[PDB]
Amino acid sequence: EISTEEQLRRLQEEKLCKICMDRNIAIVFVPCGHLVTCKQCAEAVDKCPMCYTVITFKQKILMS
Amino acid sequence: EISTEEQLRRLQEEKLCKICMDRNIAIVFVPCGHLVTCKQCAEAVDKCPMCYTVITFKQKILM
Ligand code: NI
Ligand code: NI
Ligand SMILES: [Zn+2]
Ligand SMILES: [Zn+2]
Ligand SMILES: [Zn+2]
Ligand SMILES: [Zn+2]
């Protein structure tokens, strides 16, 4: 946040699954709208691990 | 070889709505899954600008 390097790092890390930080986020949870997980990490959850809202759909998204 | 600053500008630009390029992307199109537009510009499209798939739902994103 307080330097260009940190800004760059933030935007790079922002793309990654918040659970494994090994793969890009590839799922948006409906209805809550959180971008949290890659496909692999989303497999195990029935509620959003950020807000705990019941997930009615795991929509695949393209994040590059 | 690309400067920290140029890499940063590129990623920032990547985040911008592909219609207005003023606000950040804020919507995911169902079912194609493309992230294309901010909330305001999503009102104007009935097909995804990237793949032309008919949009059945516009899901707001939260990061
Ligand atoms: Ni790792
Ligand atoms: Ni403008
Ligand atoms: Zn993951
Ligand atoms: Zn959530
Ligand atoms: Zn826009
Ligand atoms: Zn599309």
Side-chain angles (χ1 to χ4, degrees):
Chain A
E1 180 177 2
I2 68 182
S3 73
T4 58
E5 287 84 11
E6 285 306 295
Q7 290 181 303
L8 178 58
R9 182 182 190 174
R10 174 110 153 93
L11 293 191
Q12 292 171 338
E13 293 186 354
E14 199 170 85
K15 291 182 182 181
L16 302 172
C17 174
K18 296 299 178 271
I19 288 178
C20 71
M21 293 294 283
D22 287 340
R23 279 168 296 282
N24 280 7
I25 296 159
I27 295 295
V28 62
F29 298 136
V30 180
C32 72
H34 285 116
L35 297 171
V36 186
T37 61
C38 61
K39 296 177 187 178
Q40 294 68 22
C41 288
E43 185 78 17
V45 299
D46 68 337
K47 288 172 187 176
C48 175
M50 285 188 61
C51 74
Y52 304 96
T53 307
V54 170
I55 297 163
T56 65
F57 198 73
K58 299 168 185 178
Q59 167 71 49
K60 294 171 201 184
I61 74 158
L62 181 50
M63 167 96 63
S64 34
Chain B
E1 298 177 2
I2 186 175
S3 66
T4 293
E5 289 64 31
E6 176 59 18
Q7 289 181 64
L8 177 56
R9 181 156 305 189
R10 289 184 194 268
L11 294 179
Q12 286 172 340
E13 185 172 15
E14 271 181 25
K15 287 192 63 161
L16 295 174
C17 175
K18 289 263 302 178
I19 298 182
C20 69
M21 291 289 296
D22 279 336
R23 296 163 286 260
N24 283 338
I25 293 172
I27 296 282
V28 50
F29 295 148
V30 175
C32 69
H34 283 126
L35 282 169
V36 186
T37 71
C38 65
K39 289 163 41 179
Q40 188 173 127
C41 293
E43 217 67 54
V45 297
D46 59 345
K47 288 165 47 178
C48 173
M50 294 185 181
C51 71
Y52 296 149
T53 295
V54 172
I55 304 166
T56 67
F57 186 70
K58 290 149 180 182
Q59 166 70 51
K60 292 189 178 54
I61 61 194
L62 285 182
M63 181 93 70

